[PDB]
Amino acid sequence: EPLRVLELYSGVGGMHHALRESCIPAQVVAAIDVNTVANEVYKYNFPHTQLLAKTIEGITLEEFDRLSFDMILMSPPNSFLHILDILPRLQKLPKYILLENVKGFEVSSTRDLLIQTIENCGFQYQEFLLSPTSLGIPNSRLRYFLIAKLQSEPLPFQAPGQVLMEFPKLSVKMLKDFLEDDTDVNQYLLPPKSLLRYALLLDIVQPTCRRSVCFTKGYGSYIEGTGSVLQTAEDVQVENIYKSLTNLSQEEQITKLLILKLRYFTPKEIANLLGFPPEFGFPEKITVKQRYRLLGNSLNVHVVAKLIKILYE
Numbered sequence: 001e002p003l004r005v006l007e008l009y010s011g012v013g014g015m016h017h018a019l020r021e022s023c024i025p026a027q028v029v030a031a032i033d034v035n036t037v038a039n040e041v042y043k044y045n046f047p048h049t050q051l052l053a054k055t056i057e058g059i060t061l062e063e064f065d066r067l068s069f070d071m072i073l074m075s076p077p078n079s080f081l082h083i084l085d086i087l088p089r090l091q092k093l094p095k096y097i098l099l100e101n102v103k104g105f106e107v108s109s110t111r112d113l114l115i116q117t118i119e120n121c122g123f124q125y126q127e128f129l130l131s132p133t134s135l136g137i138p139n140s141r142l143r144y145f146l147i148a149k150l151q152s153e154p155l156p157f158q159a160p161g162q163v164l165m166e167f168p169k170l171s172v173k174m175l176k177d178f179l180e181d182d183t184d185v186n187q188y189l190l191p192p193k194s195l196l197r198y199a200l201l202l203d204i205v206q207p208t209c210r211r212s213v214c215f216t217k218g219y220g221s222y223i224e225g226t227g228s229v230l231q232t233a234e235d236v237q238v239e240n241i242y243k244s245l246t247n248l249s250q251e252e253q254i255t256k257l258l259i260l261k262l263r264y265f266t267p268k269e270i271a272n273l274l275g276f277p278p279e280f281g282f283p284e285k286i287t288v289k290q291r292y293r294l295l296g297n298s299l300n301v302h303v304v305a306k307l308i309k310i311l312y313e
């Protein structure tokens, strides 16, 4: 029978999308999240999946037992300590666990607790720090990953006391392959004041580029350090526009900066770069800002999918 998957801290459902891509015999029995905005997006894309809009800390052991899950997929931002407290009390321990977190987690106290708990329960595990660029995706998103399997023999690729920086046994695609034809360029052009203020601090990429900076939840609202911006103007070079800036009045610098036709990648384009399927979308009521915020909290579906494949077989 198919594995019963519990999806905690579900968000827009990146774990569920990764589960479907992995092709393994499994189905999400319960997705859990308190955020009503994330949940409307999740339900919209996964209308037949049980979604529990509840605090994870408030879920009792009985509720977890009734779910009878064989795999936990989670991206914890208390609720986490509760999960750890619940594990040794479950009538049926899940055979699989996959956790995603941020760089630095691998040295944290919380991580030390997680590993102690899972080791005490008989799980073989391996930690990783992976970015989508390792899979030929032109977008950086270095994240922590822990895969664990309930068995006696170590995973074949195990490296004790080490965090693996690559997938166990790239040719990067261009950004053009992830752009949407129907993108309303004018709508996404960076505004004048933002161009001038952040002019020298932008990471400008062209469609033929095979890299882009990590997108944060603030992308599209805050300029600096939140993700690359796209040059849509052809037959103009960034270098020539920037050379022209010294000695021009601020209004003149803006005129020059607008020529590059720099625009934000759209929420759908970020979802594409994150590996979300073609049909993935958002309800009309979800604002562009909410879309960027939700995607910023999500994960790269392709990376997790490959890790699920590794963990399962």
Ligand SMILES: Nc1ncnc2c1ncn2[C@@H]1O[C@H](CSCC[C@H](N)C(=O)O)[C@@H](O)[C@H]1O
Pocket: 008, 009, 010, 011, 012, 013, 014, 015, 032, 033, 034, 035, 038, 054, 055, 056, 057, 074, 075, 076, 077, 079, 294, 297, 298, 299
């Ligand atoms: N105590 C808690 N109970 C339930 N959900 C929680 C929670 N604390 C955080 N969350 C949710 O966990 C998420 C952390 S972001 C995880 C996003 C998800 N991996 C994705 O594919 O979108 C947020 O959606 C947040 O609302």
